[PDB]
């Protein structure tokens, strides 16, 4: 069903994450972590304190798809075990902010062709697939986008609900 998912998404905030490669999304799915540049790190930390759920929706550049979505479970923190991200050319690990813990809600893919009817008011009402890394997605658009993903029957949202 979709009822616990809708509960998790109620009054949530949504952010588009545009990964340079599949390897970084694979690492995030395996380890339950994400790291971003300080400009986005600051936005996500502010959002984490402001809302019952902050949802990251992931898309690998040139894939034509989203790869899933996850909920922030912490603010960013430094000093963990290093994560061997595959960084964009011209970028060192020192340029990253801290590490966010995340709980995956859906690890299934959604092709952009299925989200063509959804536009993001916070990005000039362009299709929600369009946006820079860290673009906030307005509540209604973000909720409908998440509801379009195939259900991920491997995930039990009971655990996610208790952290809210
Ligand atoms: O270099 S990043 O700020 N973070 C990670 C490498 C994991 C980034 C690039 N594209 C989206 N986010």
From Swiss-Prot:
Effect of residue 58 to D: Does not affect ability to influence alternative splice site selection
Result for mutant: residue 132 to F: Reduced binding affinity for N6-methyladenosine (m6A)-containing RNAs by 9-fold
Entry comment on modification after translation: Tyrosine phosphorylated.
Binding site for RNA: 18-20, 34-35, 85, 133
Annotated compartments: Nucleus; Nucleus speckle
Positions of post-translational Phosphoserine modification: 81, 92
Effect upon mutating residue 85 to D: Does not affect ability to influence alternative splice site selection
Outcome after substituting residue 68 to I: Abolishes RNA-binding and ability to influence alternative splice site selection
Reported impact of residue 34 to A: Abolishes binding to N6-methyladenosine (m6A)-containing RNAs. Abolishes binding to m6A-containing mRNAs
Phenotype upon changing residue 132 to A: Reduced binding affinity for N6-methyladenosine (m6A)-containing RNAs by 100-fold
Domain-related comment: The YTH domain mediates RNA-binding.
Subunit annotation: Interacts with SRSF1. Interacts with SRSF2. Interacts with SRSF3. Interacts with SRSF7. Interacts with SRSF10. Interacts with CPSF6. Interacts with KHDRBS1/SAM68. Interacts with TRA2B. Interacts with KHDRBS3. Interacts with EMD. Interacts with RBMX. Interacts with ZCCHC8.
Name this polypeptide is given: YTH domain-containing protein 1
The organism of origin for this protein: Homo sapiens (Human)
Lineage of producing organism: Eukaryota, Metazoa, Chordata, Craniata, Vertebrata
């Amino acid at each position: 069903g979709t009822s616990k998912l809708k509960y998790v998404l109620q009054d949530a905030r949504f952010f588009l994450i545009k990964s340079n490669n599949h390897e970084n999304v694979s690492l995030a799915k395996a380890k339950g972590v994400w790291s971003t540049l300080p400009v986005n790190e600051k936005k996500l930390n502010l959002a984490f304190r402001s809302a019952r759920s902050v949802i990251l929706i992931f898309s690998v550049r040139e894939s034509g798809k989203f790869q899933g979505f996850a909920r922030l479970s912490s603010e960013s923190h430094h000093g963990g075990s290093p994560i061997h991200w595959v960084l964009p050319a011209g970028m060192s690990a020192k340029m990253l902010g801290g590490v966010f813990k995340i709980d995956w809600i859906c690890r299934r893919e959604l092709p952009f062709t299925k989200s063509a009817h959804l536009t993001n008011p916070w990005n000039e009402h362009k299709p929600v697939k369009i946006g820079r890394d860290g673009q906030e997605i307005e509540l209604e658009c973000g909720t409908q986008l998440c509801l379009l993903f195939p259900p991920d029957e491997s995930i039990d949202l009971y655990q996610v609900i208790h952290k809210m």
